[PDB]
Amino acid sequence: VPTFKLVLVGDGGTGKTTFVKRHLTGEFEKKYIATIGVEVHPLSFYTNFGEIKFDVWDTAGLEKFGGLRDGYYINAQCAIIMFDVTSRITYKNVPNWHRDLVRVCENIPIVLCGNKVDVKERKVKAKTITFHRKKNLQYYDISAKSNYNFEKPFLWLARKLAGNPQLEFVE
Amino acid sequence: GASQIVSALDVIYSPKSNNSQRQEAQKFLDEVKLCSESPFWGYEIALQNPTNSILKYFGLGLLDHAVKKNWNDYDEGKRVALRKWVMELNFGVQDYDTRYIKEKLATLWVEVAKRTWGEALKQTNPTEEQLLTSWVDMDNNLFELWNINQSSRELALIIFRILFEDVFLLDDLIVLKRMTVIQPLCVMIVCPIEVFAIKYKFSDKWTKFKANEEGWFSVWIPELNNALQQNNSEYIIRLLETLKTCLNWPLTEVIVRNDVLSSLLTCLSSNIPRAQSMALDSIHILLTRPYSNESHYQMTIDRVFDNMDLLDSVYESLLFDPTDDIDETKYPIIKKFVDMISCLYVCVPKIKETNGQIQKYFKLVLKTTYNPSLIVSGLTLDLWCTCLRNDEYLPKLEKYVIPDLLQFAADALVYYEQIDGHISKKFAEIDFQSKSEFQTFCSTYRKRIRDIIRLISCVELDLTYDWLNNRLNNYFSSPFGQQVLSSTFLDHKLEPYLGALSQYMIVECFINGCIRWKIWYPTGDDYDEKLDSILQKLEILSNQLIALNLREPLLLKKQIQNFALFLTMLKDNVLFTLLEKIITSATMDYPEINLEERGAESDAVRDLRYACGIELNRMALLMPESLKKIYPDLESVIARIMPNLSYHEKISFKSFLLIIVLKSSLDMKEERFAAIVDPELLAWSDKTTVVGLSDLHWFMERLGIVQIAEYFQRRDIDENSDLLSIPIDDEGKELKSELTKRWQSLFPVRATRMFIHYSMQSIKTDEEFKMLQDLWRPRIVPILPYITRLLYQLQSYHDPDNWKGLPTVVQSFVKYSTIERFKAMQTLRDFADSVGHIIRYTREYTLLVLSAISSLGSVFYLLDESPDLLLNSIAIFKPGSNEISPGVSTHGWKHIMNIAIRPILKGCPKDCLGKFMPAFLPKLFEILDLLLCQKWSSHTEEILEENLLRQLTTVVVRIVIDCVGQGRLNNHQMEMRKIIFNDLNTLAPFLKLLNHLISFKDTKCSFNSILVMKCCLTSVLNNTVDEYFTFEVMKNLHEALYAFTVIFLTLCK
Ligand SMILES: Nc1nc2c(ncn2[C@@H]2O[C@H](COP(=O)(O)OP(=O)(O)OP(=O)(O)O)[C@@H](O)[C@H]2O)c(=O)[nH]1
Ligand SMILES: [Mg+2]
């Protein structure tokens, strides 16, 4: 079966490690724990066209702790730029993460995710998310606390990688 | 040993390693990164391990950390050694270096350049050593790098890309401190020395930093041209990536001298999609950049507009069939291209059309407007609107594009989101997240299409009129047109109805255009006969539409709403010939359907009639004088129509007559007013009702709960049975209809509200206002007690302690009837919900009646019983348990305060304010205090309840700030403050209410109350009030702290 290395990147404390945890187990973590270095978590999905695996690299989002800050992107085959609508600073750093990312891997599919959409006090709004409209990035509002868009990023990336828009997940 | 580093890197990058040993290796490598001599180790690793890309990248990462975090600590020797190492690594690039290695080498070079390049220029005649430390050779070194080999050429291109991005496009902190010496140096290196001399007069110390005399542009562009001819795709893409960053800032002379735009156009005509995207971005940048010399700008726009055939060919090449699967490699390019084209229209007036450039441009824009995607068309709709609304362009469009743009806009005014398999949906799954966004965008798109049609009608009225006649005639002969004409009800989700509705929206747009023509035409001597022709054409169009005898109620509603626009213009005599048709067609009977069964057909007919009433009343308000000419014929017509018109609409037409009678300067107002009104308000004074209102049991009986009990008995309904499981039957429906019909006319709250509201809707003079007050005082003052009794009953209805006297059979039904939450009934639960709806609807209309009576001013406020009557009705006290109005919904209190109390306070005349407020406010504040205290004592559906409580609190806060304002004032607040503060009886409960607001859990309410206090402290203290304030306010309690300190300092004084 195919294995695609996915690098999950985003401003620290935006919910990167909660998202991959939620995909590993249906649980949810309340604590904010600063991830140190990178966490490697093999994900897998079942689809009408068999099985695929994402070897997700959950990178640390803080300057203090990013070990090989951008060395992790080497040989990446997809990426997710994670920011949370609750704070506009995390979104303002999206272009910086995109520079750091495409600089190491040119043509990989990249998905832009707005996290923590469950809370009604979103400070990032549709009129500001045009960054994705500009960079040809696929955007999704998501929440690790709500499954409504919890599978869209991986679905889109699987379609792009497999070259098969008809691919769809099942469980 | 480096072998340790290699092992650690393998541990990190090895898939099989667990995260714990990854943490171990990472900690080791962080210590290495933090070690002394880190840059030297990085350089050694990078130079010695060219084959292992991971390890080389790690070494470069060490160097980058050194230059990016320790540049301040290093002395001169270390800094020059770092520069030497970076330059040596860059010159050593080879074909086997991966792309990211080249990117990293370029990043190192750019960092060192930003931090050292040209720092010596700030001094006068810098020494040779100062030149060396400032990296005088950088340009010469790059020129060396450019010629080493192909890989070094690509590396140099990357270096330029990153350098210019950081210097100009991004907010780099290190550059903000050096702009004055970096940016001029960039301009120097790219531009020839001669060109540079023109803008800058600097001395020889600068020119020594330049090695390529002609500047780099003389190198990149010949390279780009030679790559294009050879069709070297990769090299073209790299060159465009570098060039895209350095077209905005540099001097225009170099751009023109090298003929950059020619190369960009050649790229754009190349089949390479990446090259096309880069070239479009570059051309847009080149068009929008600031030009110091306008001759160059003229040359640029002339070059673009002379190649409109090339752009059309490019667009044709980008197009693709989207039916099966949209091509995502070219769709973004199409969006970008069409985005560029939409920005060129500002250049049109400066183009000298020698060879039909403007014609070709506008036809190209129109061609891009036909694009299947709605985003692509939405890009150009704004262009079309702006071009149409600026008189400069209209000659050009008129001669070129208007007749075709009209046809498009007409054919594009459809409901995309509801058409099955529409080609536009294919792109919706890509451009939009969810159907909500798609529908919102479709609504905006159709709005802009309607604007286009409206403006085309305004500008080209005759052409559009001929086109419209032809279109409608062709349509209503088509089989869909015949189905629409020969049918009474259509699925308003299917092709026939949607098509007919689009035709009627087009007609509406034409009418709006005709209206705008009155303002748009320059009011010359020719204006009169032109407007006469427009009126005749509109009259003919309206007669043509009427002759179709359309009966589909939901389309007939749109037809009526369109005809409403005609009459804004049409003459007095034709006014009747149209109004009679409107009235007699909207109020037709529909034997095919039994009305009041709440079926879709009955709802459509009800909406039709309600909209007809609304339009008639709106028109009467707008032009009462015109309708005076034909008023008796309107009386005759409406009398003719009354028999088959339901009460809920008898009122809506009588209000229209009333508006004409009052505001049309028609003589003998009093008798007509009596004839219109007295029959409707008569129900209030009915003696059985006057006596009945004083008993709650009679009120329940009239509401029908006794009949509900009998119905339950005849069906053997167990009071404990779950009503939701029991279905409604024929007797249930009949009883529902009977009850609602009898109730509606028993308490004519709607009739009163309509008559009072429209009567006072607009007044010209205080004399007319006095006349209206005289007309209303005899009829309202005797009735106010009964309206307040009705409200009293509706309040006491919600109290469970009250309906305890009713039969046990119906207890659950009544209890359900009080449910608050937010189609035809099917179960007894729905029946109870409908009874609750009846009660709530009557409550809302009673509140609106009380609010409307307030607008009569002296008639209401000046009464002695107004405040007691109004308050006793709302606040239902009970002996013992002092809770106010038990069982009434919090949403109910929100509506009460928002509709009745707040407008009544706001509407107090200042001559009557002396009598009303001193008797009203005390009890009002006391009631509010007790209320909010009781509800907050109790503090998903629970979250919704809390939100409603917070809403009610905000409403009370709004009332308070209206009363005394917040921390400037107006006459109302200034006048009221005298009453509030002078009357201790008012002040005490006012202070209690304010304090309770201050201490409540909601942030906004508490903060706003704190501001009110901040604005109120200095006045209240100016005896018993003082002590009460001190004690309670202090024990209760960021300007809140400021107010607390002021209170302490003042009272403790
Ligand atoms: N409201 C909301 N909070 C979330 C959501 N997902 C995660 N969080 C919060 O995010 C925090 C988890 O911290 P992390 O996931 O480690 O933050 P991070 O993005 O991984 O950043 P680093 O730890 O620095 O790598 C918890 O406090 C959660 O409450 C979400 O979907 N909605
Ligand atoms: Mg984390």
From Swiss-Prot, chain A:
It is found in: Nucleus. Keywords: Acetylation, GTP-binding, Nucleotide-binding, Nucleus, Phosphoprotein, Protein transport, Transport. One of its GO terms (cellular component) is nucleus. GTP binds at residues 11-18, 61, 115-118, 143-145. Signal peptide: none annotated. Residues 1-164 form the Small GTPase Ran-type domain. Residues 30-38 are annotated as: Switch-I. Residues 61-77 are annotated as: Switch-II. Transmembrane segments: none annotated. One of its GO terms (biological process) is regulation of nucleocytoplasmic transport. Its main location: nucleus. One of its GO terms (molecular function) is GTP binding. Coiled coil: none annotated. GTP-binding protein involved in nucleocytoplasmic transport. Required for the import of protein into the nucleus and also for RNA export. Essential for cell viability. By analogy with Ras, Ran may be activated when GTP is exchanged for bound GDP by RCC1 and inactivated when GTP is hydrolyzed by Ran upon activation by RanGAP1. Belongs to the small GTPase superfamily. Ran family. This is GTP-binding nuclear protein GSP1/CNR1. The chain holds residues 10 to 179 of 219 of the full protein.
From Swiss-Prot, chain B:
GO terms for cellular component: cytoplasm; nucleus; RNA nuclear export complex. Interacts with CEX1. It comes from Saccharomyces cerevisiae (strain ATCC 204508 / S288c) (Baker's yeast). GO terms for biological process: protein export from nucleus; RNA export from nucleus; tRNA re-export from nucleus. It comes from the Eukaryota. This is Protein MSN5. One of its GO terms (molecular function) is RNA binding. Present with 3500 molecules/cell in log phase SD medium.
